[PDB]
């Protein structure tokens, strides 16, 4: 043990020091939010502001990380390992940021997603405040219970994605599909004008989506496209008007096929399985309570 | 009992053998997912790959079904009947698949939906892993409790579908419908220019849907169309912008009719009955717990 | 008491007779569903079929209503009043239907919504089957508890509808509205080409909805329009893309107004209040259990 | 204490007087709802009606506020402070309204949002009726428990908004973006016609939204735009067809980026965090029960 280490240690564990560090964490988070609010451009109007505020915050985080480590003999293996390596990683990337700010492009342009890690320093606040800590610990000790029902959900979604690629991956590939009227039986026309060529019992509908694809290719063109589509249907997003109904009405008389596909999926997965997953989640949380 | 049956039996019931069979099940499922991901085309690029991997997996499933069946004395009536006939059906269709791969089109082109049953072999994993087994057994012992509230839900949806076919099956049949302004009272025009022919208090709106139909035919043309539409409304999917609002504003002054139709349905079928159905489901599951 | 009334009474209360009446109820319901499925047209193809099946079902319902009443001395005040007057009303309208089928237009064309009451005979099944009876009684004894939170919900929605008519009833009244770019600061243009007249920092967007209106007239033109719009937002239907976002981006710099309007409404009403209403509903049901 | 103050006090606390005040509150609320229903225009048709009904209601509220205050010696500090200052504020704005109705534009045109406060007089009814009072008190004593999970939700949404502004603030800035086909492998074309110039493996799709923007500027152009967009995704509204899918398919092969962005956000925030927030809300309410 270093000579003056005990007092630096229990001083870093002071309520006032931890509250000041929380103030610093929150103000850095707000500085980043404010950078995105008032200078999200590529040609930033105030680049030095964000650059040097970043420098100052990273400096203070480095300094009080060193104050953190001096109390544990720079080991950080024994005491509070997980949070300490999280702090070490975030301040290592912050010192990397100071190096980028000072002395050249030592980081390649392929690793900017590590420069985006500043937003996650706010997770250190979940260590300072006991309430957020209590909630995230409950979440973490509940996720393993979710695991089983989640993998059942994923297996069923994967079965449906396989079937969806088999059935619908070529729906509307021409760019158009045909739908069928009952114009005669609905009085909107006579059989004579249908046989004459004045009206028709079918309509050619464009199959192209907003994103430029045809209906089959966009939604069920591949397995991961179909899996994404089934996640979207699992959330209820436009599952009928954009996904289900084109397939349902593209089938002249076999409409029970797509109808039963989507209805069975919605029922099983959405209603039953999502509610079981969330029920297990909340049960494990409330006996974490 | 056959001479060397006992040891084959308790060997097939080995934890290691069942885990190896689970590995085979999962890897076959992943092989099918990967086929749909990397070769969903009709003109496949690697057709022999999928064909012969299918052959190999079906062979191993046949072999260890025979090892299974040795243990039950090919009886499979007495021990674990349900899973055994599920395995028998899936490997029978797999041997049918081997026959299609080897020696001709002995299956007619009408029964390809039986060739699609490979995706469901993954359900055998729910027998190997005790957690997925415990979840699916809870689901199955909860469904009969859902039954009653489900049939009440279906009866109410069927009443609404009858009424919807009666009311809205001809809405917008001309392809267009008329809506009504308050342009004069809203200052956007004078009564003089309305009487003159310069502006108007009504607008002709097209009723055609994205699927080539007019609004009434597409949603309430028949009873099963209306039932599908009410399932879509039950979920909350585009129930106003595509379904409710055209009917609501097609009524000049009788707008309370469609408004009350859809609001009552949502309030009854979607705010109250869905939550009772899911509540019964989860109650039966949690006392399955 | 009439002479042979006791035995007719306890015979109508026979399990077999009530099950046969339930079969008749369900088959009449299915006959109506099938009429809407296979003959929803105005010019029906099999009109005599529906007409005479209606006649036959109404006849049998009349007959076993008379058998019902002979057991209670035709009083139906003392024994099972509510169900008995429901049966009396439905068979009175059914005899009215027989009269329409036989001998002229004694009903005016204003009262066809009473001819639509046949769909509601299926509610008599909820008397025959004890499970559906047990569920609808729980629903009915739970609704009065919902009452309070429901009226709070309605008051808050009405406040928001008043404010919405005040703020947004004239948004986009010209048929178009203006939105504002950051094209210069986003590098998409220079200040010189903005001042020159080559590009612009504002765009004119059309405000017309799919129903022919403009945004404000159609969503907040009157109080009941705004109340309907807030019910739609309360369900989550297209509340941003069709409703919230035009108002949010029509405000050049005052975007916090509409944003806070919709965000506060969604939060309060949709999350908090809907979940409290449904929680009270399900609590009263589960202690009805 | 004033001489005849005791009897005025316990007379204002009479059940009949409080019920008459509740009748007045509800009828004023209905008068405002009816004003918005039957005269929402700027050029009102019956302006004197609303003006003088407003005058009369404000007069009666002033009068019985004075009757309220005479019983507490005009102090209103000691007895029922919160409701009394709410009444004082609402009737102060109502007397301000009487002054606007009588004698000139003493209020500047910047403070009309204070003239809109009449809709909130109905909150005084929550004091008269003990059931609504019991519900709003439960809501208020539950909100502080929601606080923690709410701020966690907001932090995570803010992280996602920062990342969304970084990634997607320039998506489709040209007004168009490019998507990529598999037309050759899907048999819809040959490689020869792709190399010839007859068909193509990419499509140019327009990025402009319904509000005149481009995708990135409109959904993630700034931090508060991205935060609003993520609130929309949390609700589940058009999160795929308008938001997620353009970003997902704009990425040629990096589609896992946007897919994982939106899928992780939906899962974490929507499912887990919204359900934990509502669970805490309802728990605090039911032990407020």
């Amino acid at each position: 043990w270093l000579p003056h280490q005990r007092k630096v240690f229990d001083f870093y564990a002071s309520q006032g020091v931890q509250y000041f560090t929380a103030f610093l964490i929150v103000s850095n988070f707000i500085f980043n939010c404010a950078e995105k609010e008032w200078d999200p451009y590529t040609d930033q109007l105030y680049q030095g502001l964000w650059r040097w505020g970043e420098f100052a915050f990273n400096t203070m985080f480095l300094i009080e990380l060193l104050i953190n480590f001096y109390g544990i003999a720079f080991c950080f293996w024994r005491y509070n390992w997980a949070w300490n390596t999280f702090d070490l990683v975030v301040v290592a990337i912050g010192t990397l940021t100071m190096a980028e700010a000072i002395g050249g492009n030592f980081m390649p342009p392929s690793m900017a997603l590590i420069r985006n890690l500043r937003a996650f320093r706010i997770f250190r606040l979940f260590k300072r405040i006991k309430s957020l800590n209590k909630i995230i610990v409950s979440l973490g000790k509940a996720i393993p219970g979710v695991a089983n029902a989640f993998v059942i959900m994923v297996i069923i979604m994967c079965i449906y994605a396989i079937l969806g690629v088999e059935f619908y991956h070529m729906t509307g590939s021409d760019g158009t599909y045909v739908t069928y009227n009952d114009n005669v039986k609905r009085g909107l026309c006579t059989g004579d004008e249908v046989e004459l060529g004045q009206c028709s019992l079918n309509q050619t509908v464009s199959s192209e989506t907003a994103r430029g694809y045809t209906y089959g290719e966009e939604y069920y063109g591949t397995f991961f496209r179909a899996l994404y589509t089934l996640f979207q249907v699992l959330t209820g997003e436009s599952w009928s008007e954009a996904v289900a109904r084109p397939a349902v009405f593209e089938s002249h008389y076999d409409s029970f096929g797509p109808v039963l596909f989507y209805v069975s999926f919605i029922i099983i997965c959405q209603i039953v399985l999502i509610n079981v997953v969330v029920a297990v989640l909340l049960d494990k949380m409330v006996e974490e309570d | 009992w056959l001479p060397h049956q006992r040891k084959v039996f308790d060997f097939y019931a080995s934890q290691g053998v069942q885990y190896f069979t689970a590995f085979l099940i999962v890897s076959n499922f992943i092989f099918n997912c990967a086929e749909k991901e990397w070769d969903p085309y009709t003109d496949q690029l690697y057709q022999g790959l999928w064909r012969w991997g299918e052959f190999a997996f079906n062979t191993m499933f046949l072999i260890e079904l025979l090892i299974n069946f040795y243990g039950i004395a090919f009886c499979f009536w007495r021990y674990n009947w349900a899973w055994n006939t599920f395995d028998l059906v899936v490997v029978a269709i797999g041997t049918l698949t081997m026959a299609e791969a080897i020696g001709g089109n002995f299956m007619p082109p009408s029964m390809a939906l039986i060739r699609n049953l490979r995706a469901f072999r993954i359900f055998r994993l729910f027998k190997r892993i005790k957690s997925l087994n415990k979840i699916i057994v809870s689901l199955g012992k909860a469904i009969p409790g859902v039954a009653n509230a489900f049939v009440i839900m279906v009866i109410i949806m069927c009443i609404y579908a009858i009424l919807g076919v009666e009311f809205y099956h001809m809405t917008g049949s001309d392809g267009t419908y008329v809506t009504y302004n308050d342009n004069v009272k809203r200052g956007l025009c004078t009564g003089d220019e309305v009487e003159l022919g310069q502006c108007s208090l009504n607008q002709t709106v097209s009723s055609e849907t994205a699927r080539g139909y007019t609004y009434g035919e597409e949603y309430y043309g028949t009873f099963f169309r209306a039932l599908y539409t009410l399932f879509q409304v039950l979920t909350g999917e585009s129930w106003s912008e595509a379904v409710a609002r055209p009917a609501v504003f097609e009524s000049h002054y009788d707008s309370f009719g469609p408004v009350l139709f859809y609001v009552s349905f949502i309030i009854i079928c979607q705010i109250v009955l869905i939550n009772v159905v899911v509540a019964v489901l989860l109650d039966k599951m949690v006392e399955e717990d | 008491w009439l002479p042979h009334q006791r035995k007719v009474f306890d015979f109508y209360a026979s399990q077999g007779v009530q099950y046969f009446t339930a079969f008749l109820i369900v088959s009449n319901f299915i006959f109506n569903c099938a009429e809407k499925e296979w003959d929803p047209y105005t010019d029906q193809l099999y009109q005599g079929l529906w007409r005479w099946g209606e006649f036959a079902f109404n006849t049998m319902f009349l007959i076993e209503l008379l058998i019902n009443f002979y057991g209670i001395a035709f009083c139906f005040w003392r024994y099972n009043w509510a169900w008995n007057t429901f049966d009396l009303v439905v068979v009175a309208i059914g005899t009215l239907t027989m009269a329409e089928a036989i001998g002229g237009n004694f009903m005016p064309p204003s009262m066809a919504l009473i001819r639509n009451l046949r769909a509601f005979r299926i509610f008599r099944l909820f008397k025959r089957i004890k499970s559906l009876n047990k569920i609808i009684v729980s629903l009915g004894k739970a609704i009065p508890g919902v009452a309070n939170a429901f009226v709070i919900m309605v008051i808050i929605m009405c406040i928001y509808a008043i404010l919405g008519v005040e703020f947004y009833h004239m948004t986009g009244s010209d048929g178009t509205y203006v939105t504002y770019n950051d094209n210069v600061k986003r590098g998409l243009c220079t200040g010189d080409e903005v001042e020159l007249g080559q590009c612009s920092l504002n765009q004119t967007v059309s405000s017309e909805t799919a129903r022919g209106y403009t945004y404000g007239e159609e969503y907040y033109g009157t109080f009941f329009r705004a109340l309907y719009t807030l019910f739609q937002v309360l369900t989550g239907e297209s509340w941003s893309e069709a409703v919230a976002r035009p108002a949010v981006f029509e405000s050049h710099y005052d975007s916090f107004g509409p944003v806070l309007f919709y965000v506060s409404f969604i939060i309060i009403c949709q999350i908090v209040l809907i979940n409290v209403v449904v929680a009270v509903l399900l609590d009263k049901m589960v202690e009805e259990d | 204490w004033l001489p005849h103050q005791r009897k005025v006090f316990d007379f204002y606390a009479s059940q009949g007087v409080q019920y008459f005040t509740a009748f007045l509150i509800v009828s004023n609320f209905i008068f405002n709802c009816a004003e918005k229903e039957w005269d929402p225009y700027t050029d009102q048709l019956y302006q004197g009606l609303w003006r003088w009904g407003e005058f009369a209601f404000n007069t009666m509220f002033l009068i019985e506020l004075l009757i309220n205050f005479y019983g507490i010696a005009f102090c209103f500090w000691r007895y029922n402070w919160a409701w009394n200052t709410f009444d004082l504020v609402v009737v102060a704005i109502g007397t301000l309204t009487m002054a606007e109705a009588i004698g000139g534009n003493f209020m500047p045109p910047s403070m009309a949002l204070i003239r809109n406060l009449r809709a909130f007089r109905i909150f005084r009814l929550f004091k008269r009726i003990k059931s609504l009072n019991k519900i709003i008190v439960s809501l208020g004593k539950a909100i502080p428990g929601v606080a923690n999970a709410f701020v966690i939700m907001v932090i995570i949404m803010c992280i996602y908004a920062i990342l969304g502004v970084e990634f997607y603030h320039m998506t489709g800035s040209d007004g168009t973006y490019v998507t990529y086909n598999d037309n050759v492998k899907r048999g819809l074309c040959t490689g020869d016609e792709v190399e010839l110039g007859q068909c193509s493996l990419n499509q140019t799709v327009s990025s402009e939204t319904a509000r005149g923007y481009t995708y990135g500027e409109e959904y993630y152009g700034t931090f508060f735009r991205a935060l609003y967009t993520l609130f929309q995704v949390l609700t589940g509204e058009s999160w795929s067809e308008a938001v997620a899918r353009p970003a997902v398919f704009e990425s040629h092969y990096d589609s896992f980026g946007p897919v994982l962005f939106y899928v992780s956000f939906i899962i974490i925030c929507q499912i887990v965090l919204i359900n934990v927030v509502v669970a805490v809300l309802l728990d605090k309410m039911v032990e407020e029960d």
């Binding site: 029920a279 049960d283 409330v286 | 869905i274 939550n275 109650d283 | - | -």
Partner: peptide, 20 residues
Amino acid sequence: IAAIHNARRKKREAAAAHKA
């Protein structure tokens, strides 16, 4: 909310059984 309502109910009977 049905998922939420049952989670709450789950604790209610757990407390009821604890007293009983």
